[PDB]
Amino acid sequence: REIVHIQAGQCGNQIGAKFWEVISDEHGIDPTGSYHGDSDLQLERINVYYNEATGNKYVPRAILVDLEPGTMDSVRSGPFGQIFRPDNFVFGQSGAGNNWAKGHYTEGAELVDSVLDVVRKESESCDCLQGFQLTHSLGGGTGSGMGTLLISKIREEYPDRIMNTFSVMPSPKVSDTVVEPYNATLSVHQLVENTDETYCIDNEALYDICFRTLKLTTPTYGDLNHLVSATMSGVTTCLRFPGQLNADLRKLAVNMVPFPRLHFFMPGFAPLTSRGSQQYRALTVPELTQQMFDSKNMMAACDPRHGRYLTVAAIFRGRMSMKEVDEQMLNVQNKNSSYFVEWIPNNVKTAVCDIPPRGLKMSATFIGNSTAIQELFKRISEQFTAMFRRKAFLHWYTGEGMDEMEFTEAESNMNDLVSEYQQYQDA
Amino acid sequence: MRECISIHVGQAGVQIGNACWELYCLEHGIQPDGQMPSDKTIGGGDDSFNTFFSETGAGKHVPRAVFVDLEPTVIDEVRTGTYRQLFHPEQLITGKEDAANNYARGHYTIGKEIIDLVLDRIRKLADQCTGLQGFLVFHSFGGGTGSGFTSLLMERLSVDYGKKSKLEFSIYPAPQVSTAVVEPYNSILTTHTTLEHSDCAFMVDNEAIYDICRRNLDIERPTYTNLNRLISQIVSSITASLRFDGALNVDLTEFQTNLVPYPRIHFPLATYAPVISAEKAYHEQLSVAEITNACFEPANQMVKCDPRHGKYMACCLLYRGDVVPKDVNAAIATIKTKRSIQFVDWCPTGFKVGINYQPPTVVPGGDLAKVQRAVCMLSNTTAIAEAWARLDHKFDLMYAKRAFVHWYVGEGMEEGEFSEAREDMAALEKDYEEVGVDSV
Numbered sequence: 001r002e003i004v005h006i007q008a009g010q011c012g013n014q015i016g017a018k019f020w021e022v023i024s025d026e027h028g029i030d031p032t033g034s035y036h037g038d039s040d041l042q043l044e045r046i047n048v049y050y051n052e053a054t055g056n057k058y059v060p061r062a063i064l065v066d067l068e069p070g071t072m073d074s075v076r077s078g079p080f081g082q083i084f085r086p087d088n089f090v091f092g093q094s095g096a097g098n099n100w101a102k103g104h105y106t107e108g109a110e111l112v113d114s115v116l117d118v119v120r121k122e123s124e125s126c127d128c129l130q131g132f133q134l135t136h137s138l139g140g141g142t143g144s145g146m147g148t149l150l151i152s153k154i155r156e157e158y159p160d161r162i163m164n165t166f167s168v169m170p171s172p173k174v175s176d177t178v179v180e181p182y183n184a185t186l187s188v189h190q191l192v193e194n195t196d197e198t199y200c201i202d203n204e205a206l207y208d209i210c211f212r213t214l215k216l217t218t219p220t221y222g223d224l225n226h227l228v229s230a231t232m233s234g235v236t237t238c239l240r241f242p243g244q245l246n247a248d249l250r251k252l253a254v255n256m257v258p259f260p261r262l263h264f265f266m267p268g269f270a271p272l273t274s275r276g277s278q279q280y281r282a283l284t285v286p287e288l289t290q291q292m293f294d295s296k297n298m299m300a301a302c303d304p305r306h307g308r309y310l311t312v313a314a315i316f317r318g319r320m321s322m323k324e325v326d327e328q329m330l331n332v333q334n335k336n337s338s339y340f341v342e343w344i345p346n347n348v349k350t351a352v353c354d355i356p357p358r359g360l361k362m363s364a365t366f367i368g369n370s371t372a373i374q375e376l377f378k379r380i381s382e383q384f385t386a387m388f389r390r391k392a393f394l395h396w397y398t399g400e401g402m403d404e405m406e407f408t409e410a411e412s413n414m415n416d417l418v419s420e421y422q423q424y425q426d427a
Numbered sequence: 428m429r430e431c432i433s434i435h436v437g438q439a440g441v442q443i444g445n446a447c448w449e450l451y452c453l454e455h456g457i458q459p460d461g462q463m464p465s466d467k468t469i470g471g472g473d474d475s476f477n478t479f480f481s482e483t484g485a486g487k488h489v490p491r492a493v494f495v496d497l498e499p500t501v502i503d504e505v506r507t508g509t510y511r512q513l514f515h516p517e518q519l520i521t522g523k524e525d526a527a528n529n530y531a532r533g534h535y536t537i538g539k540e541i542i543d544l545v546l547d548r549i550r551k552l553a554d555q556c557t558g559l560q561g562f563l564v565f566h567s568f569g570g571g572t573g574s575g576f577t578s579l580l581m582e583r584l585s586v587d588y589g590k591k592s593k594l595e596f597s598i599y600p601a602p603q604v605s606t607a608v609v610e611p612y613n614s615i616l617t618t619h620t621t622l623e624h625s626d627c628a629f630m631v632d633n634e635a636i637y638d639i640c641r642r643n644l645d646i647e648r649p650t651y652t653n654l655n656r657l658i659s660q661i662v663s664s665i666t667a668s669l670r671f672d673g674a675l676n677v678d679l680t681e682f683q684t685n686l687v688p689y690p691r692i693h694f695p696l697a698t699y700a701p702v703i704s705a706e707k708a709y710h711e712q713l714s715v716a717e718i719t720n721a722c723f724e725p726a727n728q729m730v731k732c733d734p735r736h737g738k739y740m741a742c743c744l745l746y747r748g749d750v751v752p753k754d755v756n757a758a759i760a761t762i763k764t765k766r767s768i769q770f771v772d773w774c775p776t777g778f779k780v781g782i783n784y785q786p787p788t789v790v791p792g793g794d795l796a797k798v799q800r801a802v803c804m805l806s807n808t809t810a811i812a813e814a815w816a817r818l819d820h821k822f823d824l825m826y827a828k829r830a831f832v833h834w835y836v837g838e839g840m841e842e843g844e845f846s847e848a849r850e851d852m853a854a855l856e857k858d859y860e861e862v863g864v865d866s867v
């Protein structure tokens with residue numbers, strides 16, 4: 001049940017590297033690629049994300065993509081930099097200049113075939129590929145523009161394979177350029193059509209968590225990415241360790257996605273921890289459950305009370321009373337049953353893994369499919385329109401062959417997505 | 428890779444080039460003979476300073492630069508100066524007879540005789556680049572070569588190098604240090620002609636620099652030597668992101684994405700701080716907050732205008748030296764609630780921030796105090812259009828009587844080129860007015 005991992009762009013490669021270093025530690029894999037752990041549970045499903053190398057080394061089934069070598073050179077010189085298969089480093093030189101058009105139509109188009117060659121080489125080694133995952137931001141040019149181009153071509157060559165993304169949404173609070181709403185809007189429509197799951201990781205929420213909650217007065221991208229890798233570890237625990245759950249990507253998606261276009265998830269994590277800052281008292285199960293449903297642990301910066309949950313999934317990790325988990329989960333729902341749709345019976349599901357993440361005696365990862373996610377897309381839409389009204393900064397795009405019409409279309413189908421969410425919120 | 432080729436045109440362009448490359452050498456530890464001890468990769472490399480310097484097998488670090496003038500005496504001082512070993516003879520190009528402050532001679536009569544040779548020498552620099560990013564063109568508005576030949580060169584560069592980026596450092600004419608009368612003509616002509624071929628242009632008002640040297644450095648009567656050393660520091664701050672590395676470093680092209688909302692709106696306003704003498708900097712630290720706040724004091728701008736009576740479309744802060752984000756953010760928060768800062772309604776209000784850790788350097792025997800931290804603000808303000816308005820008015824005064832026009836006609840130009848150039852300028856002023864009107 002192999003999964004092929006792809007990371008594109010600066011943000012995509014930075015959270016991607018973080019992800020691989022986190023789960024490598026969980027599976028006992030060192031930066032050389034050698035297993036030294038103490039449980040067979042660490043190796044029972046290690047083939048999901050790792051390839052076995054002759055001379056018992058484990059090599060991440062990961063493909064690293066960029067239009068400039070800057071960040072990928074930082075990866076190769078990073079902590080676990082040497083664990084990656086060197087041939088899986090695919091990079092151009094020209095960069096994308098935070099331009100969706102450059103990533104999707106010109107610069108990215110020139111490189112995209114080379115990436116697919118590596119994808120194919122990794123797929124043909126898979127006994128039974130269950131799907132792909134992609135890490136990237138939507139606000140830049142490579143991850144946003146070339147990443148969605150990649151997704152389109154992967155769906156052409158593998159039309160019956162699951163494609164899931166962890167997608168970082170842009171925010172003025174944590175902003176590189178002013179054209180991020182343009183790139184995000186163009187990307188969102190691609191995701192609506194060609195992914196099965198998109199985890200909406202909002203940089204606004206990540207900032208607010210680091211600031212308001214983790215009490216970090218000046219959070220970096222590194223602080224923000226600690227939350228992301230911790231969440232990605234939790235979202236994929238189900239797949240990497242034995243337990244109650246052994247669903248493949250498709251079965252997971254089936255029970256979470258009632259309508260094909262509404263597959264944008266609000267992720268959450270508890271307890272919220274800043275890097276380095278140890279703390280010694282583990283949370284009680286009522287504390288875990290209450291936090292993971294609280295908006296302050298949400299990473300999408302949407303208020304779940306402003307919408308309704310279509311489906312909810314929660315994975316608890318560590319040694320704990322699942323009977324107590326059962327009671328607290330059904331506590332939360334039965335208390336707030338007005339924020340859950342009533343036409344999808346038993347739409348709140350839970351699972352436990354015995355193995356806790358590093359540093360915590362117990363934790364919980366939240367995956368909400370809420371209609372409140374429309375607030376994220378409305379936010380991007382407003383910022384899009386404010387500039388597009390005056391056709392501001394459009395020359396960066398028309399200079400790469402794009403027409404105003406493609407923006408008008410992108411704008412319109414995100415507004416459709418928004419209204420489609422509104423339809424089921426009032427059902 | 429990502430090489431940048433600098434082109435210095437005319438007296439102002441050339442002599443500012445001297446100031447910059449001397450300053451660059453000091454910043455990178457490059458000796459006047461081109462040798463750089465700290466550079467262990469001999470004969471080549473892909474370091475950040477390699478964007479501006481190429482390397483010979485003998486370990487010489489050579490500026491990716493061409494110097495051009497239609498008259499030899501200014502460039503001759505480069506050929507016999509302190510840094511003559513730095514440049515290969517073919518990088519320094521001179522004619523025999525200048526353009527005599529006449530655009531027509533620079534663009535046509537005298538310019539056409541040397542333009543092919545210049546393009547050949549530039550081509551020889553490009554061919555040594557593995558990933559050329561674009562050009563940096565230094566010139567005056569008022570000179571015949573600085574105006575006429577530059578616009579000719581920019582036109583030819585568009586043909587030979589497609590859409591490859593072209594940036595300008597343009598000297599805006601001030602009567603305090605000029606002995607020319609026809610500069611408004613040359614200014615309007617080159618701006619009109621170059622407008623389509625430039626991606627971004629940094630105007631430097633000589634009067635602004637003149638005032639700063641007088642008020643901040645207590646220089647009684649500034650010379651070109653005084654102005655150029657200050658200008659070089661601003662140029663250094665802007666190119667620093669290309670020549671140095673760093674986690675918090677933000678490349679100029681990324682700032683550019685924010686600074687240019689429409690192709691024609693590509694004239695950022697530069698403000699620099701701190702400009703302070705050794706006498707006054709003694710026992711006086713300039714904090715991040717203090718120098719940041721100085722960026723919104725109009726007296727510190729490279730161009731005379733009032734941003735407080737205009738609207739912002741972009742605001743960038745380029746720090747160098749002992750500076751961390753925490754202090755920057757705090758300083759900005761203070762300023763935002765105490766300054767007259769108003770954005771147009773179609774643009775976000777956040778300040779884009781860059782930090783290079785390598786601190787500012789000063790040229791020996793200069794006037795500027797060596798400081799631990801400096802900042803250059805690059806903002807896109809409607810107020811920059813005031814500089815166009817003043818220039819266009821001086822143009823109108825003379826052109827109504829056709830003063831000095833016979834000099835231009837005699838070298839092959841027609842009055843239709845004047846009116847056409849002026850109309851482009853009128854449309855440009857209206858463009859800046861239109862981007863500041865609130866949306867519907």
Ligand SMILES: Nc1nc2c(ncn2[C@@H]2O[C@H](COP(=O)(O)OP(=O)(O)OP(=O)(O)O)[C@@H](O)[C@H]2O)c(=O)[nH]1
Pocket residue numbers: 436437438439440442443496497525526527528529567568569570571572573574598599600601604605606607610633651652654655658
């Ligand atoms: N800041 C600064 N301005 C200069 C310098 N040299 C000349 N200028 C300005 O440039 C304008 C005159 O143009 P020049 O550059 O001297 O003339 P040119 O480009 O050599 O063209 P020619 O007419 O052929 O000599 C005047 O406004 C001067 O004040 C300089 O070294 N520094």
Ligand SMILES: Nc1nc2c(ncn2[C@@H]2O[C@H](COP(=O)(O)OP(=O)(O)O)[C@@H](O)[C@H]2O)c(=O)[nH]1
Pocket residue numbers: 008009010011012014015096097098099137138139140141142143144168169170171174175176180203206221222224225228
């Ligand atoms: N969470 C997070 N966001 C990032 C990181 N790096 C960049 N971003 C965001 O991604 C957007 C810029 O996209 P980027 O990945 O740098 O562009 P690309 O390299 O061309 O794909 C902006 O919204 C940034 O805030 C990171 O390390 N973590």
Ligand SMILES: COC(=O)Nc1nc2ccc(C(=O)c3cccs3)cc2[nH]1
Pocket residue numbers: 133164197235236238239245249252253256313314315349350351367
């Ligand atoms: C890389 O792609 C994924 O990990 N997708 C994914 N989709 C998922 C849906 C649910 C869960 C999960 O852990 C559940 C807990 C309780 C019921 S399902 C885990 C999931 N992981």
Ligand SMILES: [Ca+2]
Pocket residue numbers: 466467468469470471472473482
């Ligand atoms: Ca070298």
Ligand SMILES: [Mg+2]
Pocket residue numbers: 010011140176
């Ligand atoms: Mg980036």
Ligand SMILES: [Mg+2]
Pocket residue numbers: 437438496498525570572
């Ligand atoms: Mg001259």
